[PDB]
Structures are given as structure tokens and as C-alpha cells.
Protein: Orotate phosphoribosyltransferase 1
Organism: Saccharomyces cerevisiae
Amino acid sequence: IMLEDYQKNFLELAIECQALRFGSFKLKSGRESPYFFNLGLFNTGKLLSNLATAYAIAIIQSDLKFDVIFGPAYKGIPLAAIVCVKLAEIGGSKFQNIQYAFNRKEAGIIVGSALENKRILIIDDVMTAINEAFEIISNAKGQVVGSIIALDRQEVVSTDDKEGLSATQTVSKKYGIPVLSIVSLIHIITYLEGRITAEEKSKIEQYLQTYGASA
Amino acid sequence: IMLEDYQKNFLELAIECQALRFGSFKLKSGRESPYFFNLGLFNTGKLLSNLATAYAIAIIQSDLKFDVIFGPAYKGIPLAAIVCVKLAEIGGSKFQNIQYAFNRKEAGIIVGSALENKRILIIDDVMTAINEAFEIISNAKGQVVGSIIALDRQEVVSTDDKEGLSATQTVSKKYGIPVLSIVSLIHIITYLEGRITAEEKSKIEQYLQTYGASA
Ligand SMILES: [Mg+2]
Ligand SMILES: [Mg+2]
């Protein structure tokens, strides 16, 4: 009803491959969470194919205009790559010539074409690092025009500031750009209706209440 | 006649995107070469799509049996990824559950599933580094069963040993495994017939004579 078909498909695969788990989980903060998410578990050719398609459709539907998809080392490298491919495969003539690029985290160089006057989309797995990418890109004269992750957790950044912004909202405000996501926690909650009873369904909604950011 | 359709298609794209150039080029050794090759120039979604397909068909046709495709950091990360995807998309039911993996070059950890008792294919751009990958994989109890690159240059490793082995042959002998390639220099030479006259066509064949390894 609210959920697109690519979002429903992503979430069912997410649950099947165990990238999305439900139960009792303690976050790094110590806060207790009704689910756990690891995109890494999208780890086969089939799963990666579907993951790439799900990112690709979110990007096409967003209407965002860009020249280069950029994935921060290390998790963003394979993601940038498979999604660049997918865009060209299902996106039509406009997405044929989209370049991809990423960075060596040397102990900084960019692997790809010159970013000067190029509009850049950042792709990564999650958003929790962000400034690093913007720095690298702006140094190369690249203009970041957007960001996409798989799951927007929609959690307020500060505990004792319930009316504060989420991670994605914070980034979107600072750089003036959209931060897309395949799904958000509200989407998880929506998909779970009729798959669970008002038991765990409640738990998660009551977690969105306590820790979730407003639209 | 000798060249498969995926090889013809790869080479035409290679020439179109300038990843394959002809002219006078000095190698690192100082040796003079009739062509230059950079896989990096396969840099758009369309080009990456076709590159992935070309690797994927070479792998399917080879009949090699493996569980994991592994790409050495950094150039092998996106390659491992898009090709893992492609295998699942065109390879049928047998390639659905192939995992992919790579390595952080930390100043070593593997990003992916446990490699123990898993049969591994290495994918990289060229072969000139090789031991690094084998070490990493054997430590994790992974069994390397093969390697694939885009272009086999077929050059003898030692100048003053004309009957010596090529780079790929050397690796194949040391580890007892096949080292596949989308194309070799003999394939380049074959494709160029009727596209050039006996002028540069000669030059390259006379370079294969001087510097090429025997079958
Ligand atoms: Mg639309
Ligand atoms: Mg066959």
C-alpha cells in the first residue's frame, strides 16, 4: 500500500538471507533494539543481483541527476560497482555512460575518471566517515549531489533531544543534499503487518516512538 | 573462426573505450610494444556490464568448479563483485549461490564468508601480488582452484630464455591451477585481420615472435 514492489522484494530477501533479524539486540550505545541489520549477508551472486536492482530502482525513481557513483572504501566499492552496472542495464539510455569511482585508503587516491565538474552520488551500506567522502570528493573538484544507503534507521542522533534530526537528516541538512534509502524502519514495520501478531509488531513501533526521528 | 562471440564483442568495446590502443609503447622493462592495455577504461555502467558478461562467459565455458570468487584489493574488488552477480544472472541454477570475497590491505582481513573448505577462483585485471592472494587464501583454509584475468599477454618472463614460460603459465605451473583469460594476444592478432593491412598486422605478429611464449 505504502511500500513499492522493489522494497517488498528487498525486505523478503533481507529476512531470508538473515541480513535482517528480529529479536533483542544491544547497539554500540547500549540501547536495546528489536532488530539487527547487516547488509554483508547479501553475499551470493543472486543476493547481490537483487541488492543491485533494489538500489538501482530507488535511484531511478528519485530522478536525481548525477555523472559518477562513488563508493567509500571498503564496503562501498562493490556496491558502487554492481549498482553502476545495474543502472545501465535497467535504467535506459540516460544511465549508459555513468562512471563509477572509489578510493584507496592509503597510509587517498581516487580510482576512476577526473571528478572535476562531475556530479557525484555516494553509495554506501549504512550511515553512522561521511565527512571523509565529502572531503575526498571536494578536493578532486567533485560536487556531491546526493547519497544512498540500504537502510535508514531513522534514529535521533542525541538521546536527550527527542526532537532532533536523524543521521540521514543531519547529513542532508549539512550538505544540502538528499540521502536516499531503499527502505526505512517505518517500511520494515509496514511489511511485517500480517506476518507477526500485535506482539513484536508492537515492540518495534514502541521502539520507533522512543528512538525514532520525526519526518 | 577461432574467436568466440564474447571475445569479439569484448575486443570491439576494448578498442572503442580506448582500453586497447595500438601504436608504439615502451613497457616498464624498456621493451617496445605495438599496443597498450588498460582495463580501467572500462569505466561506465554499460562498459562494466559488458566486461562482467565477458568474464562470466569465459568462466562458465571453462567448466571450473568453485564456491567463491575472490578479488585482490583494489582492482579486483569491483571485478569480483560484478562478475559474481553476472554468473548468477546468466549462468543458471549452479551459479545462484556463489559467494564473493576480497581483502582489506590493512597496515589483511577478508570481507566475506569463512573460506574453510571453500574452492576459490581469483579474479583480477592483469597478471604481472599473485603470491599475496594465495597466502591470504591458504591461511583462511581456502583452496585456490583457478585464476582469471582479462588479457593474457603471453610474454616470456625472462628476456634471454625464449623457451621459458609466460606469466600465466608460470602461475599455472606453480599452483597446479588453470589461469583463464577473456582474450590473449593471439586473439587480438586474429580479430585485427581485415581491419588493418599487412603493415601493423605484421608488426604485432613479429612482436609475438620475439617476445611471445609457446603454447
Ligand atoms: Mg518517476
Ligand atoms: Mg561447454
